[PDB]
Amino acid sequence: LGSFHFDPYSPAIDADPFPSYKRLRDEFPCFWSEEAQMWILSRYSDIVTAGQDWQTYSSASGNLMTELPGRAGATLGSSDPPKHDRLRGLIQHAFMKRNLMALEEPIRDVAKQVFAQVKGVKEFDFKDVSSQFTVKVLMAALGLPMGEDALVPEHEVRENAVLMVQSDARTRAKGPEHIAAYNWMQDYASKVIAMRRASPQNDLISNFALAEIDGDRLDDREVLLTTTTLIMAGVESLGGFMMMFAYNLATFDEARRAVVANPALLPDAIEESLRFNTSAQRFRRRLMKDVTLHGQTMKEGDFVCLAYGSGNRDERQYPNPDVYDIARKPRGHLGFGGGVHACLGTAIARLAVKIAFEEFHQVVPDYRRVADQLPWMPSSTFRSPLVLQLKAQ
Ligand code: HEM
């Protein structure tokens, strides 16, 4: 009794990691967690340094806190340069050719359709609308055919996208149904990719197949794995963050009233929510050499947790860090990571959340949490409520 532990597999850390993060930063800034069997970095400046130093802190053994089964050499998140940079350059080229900000209309169309479903409703769970919106945004961006009339109906894609990002609550690892959903999605994406190769369209999948930089192109394994890992990354992170932003606005009346009255404040409020509580809380790296930090002798081959959610609450970087201040305009926050793996979806996410809440707030201009104590999702990497029950006010 009394000994300090940090267990990212613990439901206590799902629900409220922040007091433990503060003890890490203040008392144990390079902490060995016996439950995670890895070191924990918690201070903003240490996380920035480690995230930038990919030669020391490798992603090639996986970047999720709990492990990913497949082909890391074709993924961005679980690869190191130079391969990572070749892939990222080609994908960013495809993003440029499509023009991500021209997704304004399909995203706003989705938002109007989804959030109309809570018009006039006394009480609802934001998880439903936010998951629907999230998957529809990824489908519209990639070019996965939408509508229940589509050959593969939309709700079936959503069901498999939502399941494939989940993990077993007990072990926080993937189970057979999660791997089956991933393989279903790989097969589904493969059929769309073939169709877009035959007849390119104004979507991201088509631009993945067409992108070339001085004779280089993404190979067959690479267009597929790019499509599927963008679905995976987007659904897990954007869906969780949609919930975090609504949770904050429901909790902090003055912030909610301000952005509803002046929706031009939404981008700043979104950045303060990314700082205050990103959905993408904790990622891992593997040491490529021995590193001594704060008196601790980390060893080659050890794993390390970059607790982005802790660095963003570090008073050494952000004064009064536990204050939710939508006027803060935080710069350099870690809500999207940092370095060569900084979120590839940053611009899409910022646009999508902005448009979603523009339209949501026209349907429901005032709302609060129903609950004091909320249930939180079991994840060693991500954080969001399982249920975000809101009441119209
Ligand atoms: C609010 C929404 C989102 C948040 C908070 C978020 C957060 C993050 C974070 C923290 C990382 C870095 C992980 C690491 O350091 O290992 C990351 C990487 C990544 N994200 Fe996001 N993400 C969001 C939305 C998206 C979306 C919508 C997409 C796709 C459309 C996406 C695709 C990716 C990819 C592909 C990577 C890996 C990039 C690389 O390794 O070079 N994310 N995200």
Residue numbers in the entry: 3 to 395
Q: What sentences appear in the manuscript?
A:
Here, we show that the natural α-diazoester azaserine can be produced by Streptomyces albus engineered with a previously uncharacterized biosynthetic gene cluster and act as the carbene precursor for coupling with intracellularly produced styrene to generate unnatural amino acids containing a cyclopropyl group, which has wide applications in organic synthesis and occurs frequently in medicine development, by a reaction catalyzed by an evolved cytochrome P450 mutant with its native cofactor. Because the activity of P450-T2 was the highest among the enzymes tested in the initial screening, the activity of this enzyme was further confirmed by in vitro reaction with purified protein.
Although the diastereoselectivity (dr, the percentage of the major diastereomer versus the sum of all diastereomers in the product) from the reaction catalyzed by whole cells containing P450-T2 was 87.8%, it was 99.3% when the reaction was catalyzed by purified protein. To guide the directed evolution, the crystal structure of P450-T2 was determined. The first-round mutant (S239V) catalyzed the reaction to form 46 times the amount of product as was formed by the wild type enzyme. This site corresponds to the T268 residue in P450 BM3, a site that has been reported to be important for increasing the activity of P450 BM3 toward carbene transfer reactions. The third-round mutant (S239V, F338H) was about 5 times more active than the S239V mutant. After 5 rounds of evolution, the fifth-round mutant (P450-T2–5) catalyzed the reaction with high diastereoselectivity (dr >99%) and moderate yield (42.7%); this yield is 251 times higher than that from the reaction catalyzed by WT enzyme.
